Design a protein around this nucleic acid. Structure first.
Lengths: 583, 21, 25, 614
DNA sequence: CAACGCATGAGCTAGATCCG
């Protein structure tokens, strides 16, 4: 058979072992499975507990503070895929602060579809440097495995198993003391695999019973229908939870239970586009009896009624709940702490937000690169405001670079006043074009949006300067660039010239960082061009280099240095980096 | 929220007795 | 110290609840 | 004769020689150099036949077409040589079309040596007896001329001769003037036309013998058409060739106490000679311009350029070397360089007083203003607009203004400005108005409350050392454990130590650079906590690299993170003296982010697994 | 009218279209 057991909802197990007995013949756990907070448990009675027919777990698996589990291969011998529809702080498997875990033992795990794994804080865990995670789950950088017993190479680590060469060394990869993992030839990647290397049917994962049979597979991929695997199951049936197909009688009677709302966790499942979807999306309403979705008269949005007036987006567990809703009736904070990169998943679930009726706040977020994942922002209505009468707000965003691409985006904030502070890679030019296209024009503070602490660690200029004449000798090399004048003839402290060695052409760009270091390009100051009162004059300025080694390549660029002012002009000018070699 | 009423302020033993049935 | 947060919170709460068990909906 | 006139410096034109229409004794130096587009037909009608005695030197450096000097300076008699050029008093270097030297009338160059070079058409150089013209003969330098290969027939007229090195050659300047010699009975006063010697005071030619009123170059001193060996009172010596009264030396001191650009040389009266500056250990009294000696440290005195001087680096600070009292404003803008440990204390470590207003604008490399070590007062006669006298912006690393225990500042007027100085704390700019006293004459100054204190702490508690044990080479240091009220926040400890000669070391001193330190920073991981008053929880660190019978300084500094309200904590122990028998800034932030990432997850995990009862 | 003569090259005298 394929899935011989009974479908089985999510469970929490606490303070005892008596509640564990209701997992006797469950084969798939939609929902999550937690094992928490078991203190009075000797290690001797986990030897006679085993769950053989557990095959796939859809959401995640959390184990936290149990006593007496030496290795997991007594309980979960056969879970092959954990799928990850509902994550847990962007992790799909989290094992946190066990005391007696010796071996990981999950020796049959093949494919983690969506999410990452975080194995943290175990005072006895060994065998973590022998897993080869990069084949099991399909991302590799988002994991976090620190502070363990394998912080040192001291657990022994004997294993009698391809000994793969994914890294640069010939190390062997094994699960436990007496089980070595399966990596077979890589012609078919995730389509299943037998012992003697013969590839399976295309629609399978993990093990196979007999090769090329969609009837006797074990861990099926796209959907499930009557003991088979069908790529797109036909419309006598509809999709459900993206793993099943089920008939008309099932998706209707769940209305009749929780139309009498005894608990607000149930959802009235309504048919739409061959799916059994809980809430029919924006621009659609349900009819009275027949339970379909029809086109709306005018616009009818799905108003996304936010509890308590605030929300704190931390990860894809909290940004999962705003999927598909369009008019937020509250205010959003954004506080993403640490992080490697989260802009790949934040777009596809909260990127359909049209009207927002509160304030934003982007505080302490480290790994943000751009605010572009908000896609269809039209108006920040702003009936409320923050403390100090603000609507937009930023703090301490150490890698923010861009608010929005202003060539094809429009944003009208009706009332409220801006606020900007400590954005070390955001220029004033991107927030001043923000100032003209927003609904506010001259409502500022003095002290307004901070003119000093923005953009200190990234240089950025707009008008370009070209070069005109370059002459080269065996010790001296001469520059001459075409002039430039701001609208104020006194608003010029001069120029500054940079030159560094570079033996190859892959030199970086100027970061703008001042840390008293050797990558400050050995700055040579240039006297300002004296006021010529003449178009053609001796104010086509140049300089002469003197201390050169012969037959080497130098990288030169030139930048002006003007006084910044209260008026919103004179951003400066900066040339591009070129290369010149002395003979 | 246990981490906001027993970490940002002191909490009494009448309050955290609510957590256990 | 009566400022119970961090890793001590999961241990100090156990001794005041050593037989009733924890509570969930 | 004529009147005295200062020294020229002419280049590339000829129109500047009209200013010698009436000069007779040009005190200063005349140097004619770099004239390219001048044909020889431009030098025929030009003559200064009354220039008679020049004092400093002469220099002719690449003029073109100067055919002979016998029509420009035909009556030079004496050059003095007080100030010299490479220790040379007459420099003829690299002319062309120069046939004859022809300065047929100079008699006694006093001090120096003549340097004649590389002028490829010059003869009449072999018939010039420099034994009786300059008194110190052995340093002249006459090489690479026309007369390496003798081709030109230098026949001259009837004219007397002497011997120099065994050859009895005749002596002549040009082909129509010969070198005037005086017989050895009247050595330096110079002879007349028939061979009598002149008065006992004159140099070179004299018009009538035995009359000191009418010779043409006084050797010692000139005084009012007569000639005198030592000028008596009420006169004074000036530039050691002429004598003036008191009124002729006073007024030009006030007439260029204000500079056009430089300077003047402000004249003093000191022992019968007007000198530019008194020597060391002597200072001018401003009343009658007399020069009086010293007691203790003497003022210099250092005035400055146009009221404000900016220091960008060490090379900008070199003009203020040794300057004690400064009559104007000052501004410091230091960014970086190399070897910034002790050099900023070296250039301005003896500064005494400053009288304008002080600006610490845009300075980044500094940590502390303790390098004004001897400064006592900013009185501030002139005021900064906004009624300010003390201004500070863009100080990203400044941490400590001044030590108000070992030092006593005062000031009188003006106001203060401390904005956008994060590391500069708030209680230390509350600690200065007891010493400066702006709570006296009480005024509303403008310092914002939120603009400081960021990345800083001032409510620190006091760590007490617990046990100390010294061997011959090792010392252990265990102390009492400090915890912030949320014990996840403490990343670790920081220990500092350095050798110490006495019991007077202050806490933040002498390092004052970007990535350098005088101390020896060492780290130590925190211990564990077990909710136990008595346990194995006292932290520790072992110090190994010691020396026998030395005396050190040690203290403990914590390092914690920030909760999201700008509310920090921390501690700092006392400075304890004990006696025996690369972490860059980018690595600080990313290692503090990872500790705040592990705090956030296990703060979230408690939040959903415990649910209260309704 | 577009390198080189009417100098040298960072050794108190200028600073590389610095001068025709």
């Amino acid at each position: 058979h394929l899935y011989p057991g009974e479908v089985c909802p999510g469970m929490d197990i606490r303070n005892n072992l008596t509640r564990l007995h209701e997992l006797e013949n469950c084969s798939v756990i939609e929902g999550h499975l937690q094992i928490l907070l078991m203190f009075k448990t000797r290690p001797e009675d986990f030897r006679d507990l085993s769950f053989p027919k557990l095959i796939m777990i859809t959401d995640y698996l959390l184990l936290f503070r149990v006593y007496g589990l030496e290795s997991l291969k007594d309980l979960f011998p056969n879970l092959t895929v954990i799928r990850g529809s509902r994550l847990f702080f962007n992790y799909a498997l989290v094992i946190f602060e066990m005391v007696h875990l010796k071996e990981l033992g999950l020796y049959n795990l093949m494919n983690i579809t969506r999410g990452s794994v975080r194995i943290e804080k175990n005072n006895e865990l060994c065998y973590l440097a022998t897993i080869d995670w990069s084949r099991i789950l399909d991302s590799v950088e988002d994991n976090h495995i620190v502070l363990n017993k394998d912080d040192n190479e001291e657990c022994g680590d004997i294993c009698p198993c391809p000994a793969t060469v994914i890294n640069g060394q010939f190390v062997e990869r094994c699960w436990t003391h007496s089980h070595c993992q399966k990596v077979c030839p890589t012609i078919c990647k995730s389509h299943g695999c037998t012992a003697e290397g013969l590839c399976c049917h295309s629609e399978c994962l993990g093990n196979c019973s007999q090769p090329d049979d969609p009837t006797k597979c074990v861990a099926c991929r796209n959907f499930y229908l009557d003991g088979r695997c069908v790529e797109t199951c036909p419309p006598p049936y509809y999709h459900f939870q993206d793993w099943r197909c089920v008939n008309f009688s099932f998706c209707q009677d769940l209305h009749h239970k929780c139309k009498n709302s005894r608990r607000q966790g149930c959802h009235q499942y309504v048919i739409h586009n061959n799916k059994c979807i809980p809430e029919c999306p924006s621009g659609y309403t349900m009819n009275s009896s027949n339970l379909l979705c029809t086109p709306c008269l005018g616009p009818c949005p799905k108003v996304c009624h936010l509890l308590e007036g605030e929300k704190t987006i931390d990860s894809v567990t909290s940004a999962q709940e705003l999927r598909g809703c369009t008019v937020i009736n509250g205010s959003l904070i954004i506080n993403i702490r640490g992080g490697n990169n989260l802009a790949a998943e934040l777009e596809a679930n909260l990127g359909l937000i049209e009207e927002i009726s509160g304030y934003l706040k982007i505080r302490r977020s480290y790994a943000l690169v751009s605010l572009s994942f908000f896609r269809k922002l039209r108006l920040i209505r702003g009936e409320t405001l923050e403390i100090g009468n603000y609507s937009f707000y930023a703090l301490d965003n150490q890698n923010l670079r861009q608010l929005w691409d202003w060539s094809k985006h429009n944003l009208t904030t009706t009332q409220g006043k801006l606020f900007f502070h400590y954005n070390p890679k955001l220029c004033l030019s991107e927030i001043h074009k923000m100032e003209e296209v927003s609904g506010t024009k001259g409502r500022q503070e003095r002290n307004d949006i901070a003119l000093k602490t923005n953009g200190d660690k990234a240089s950025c200029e707009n008008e370009l300067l070209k070069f005109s004449y370059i002459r080269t000798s065996f010790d001296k090399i001469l520059l001459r660039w075409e002039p430039y004048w701001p609208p104020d003839f006194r608003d010029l402290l001069g120029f500054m010239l940079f030159y560094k060695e570079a033996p190859y052409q892959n030199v970086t760009e100027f970061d703008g960082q001042d840390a008293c270091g050797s990558n400050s390009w050995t700055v040579v100051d240039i006297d300002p061009p004296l006021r010529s009162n003449d178009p053609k004059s001796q104010n086509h300025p140049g300089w002469l280099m003197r201390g050169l080694k012969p037959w080497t390549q130098y990288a030169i660029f030139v930048k002006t240095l003007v006084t910044f002012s209260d008026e919103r002009r004179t951003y400066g000018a900066k040339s591009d980096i070129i290369y010149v070699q002395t003979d | 929220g246990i981490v906001e009423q027993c970490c940002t302020s002191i909490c009494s033993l009448y309050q955290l007795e609510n957590y256990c049935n | 110290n009566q400022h119970l947060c961090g890793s001590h919170l999961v241990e100090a709460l156990y001794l005041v609840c050593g037989e009733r068990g924890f509570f969930y909906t």
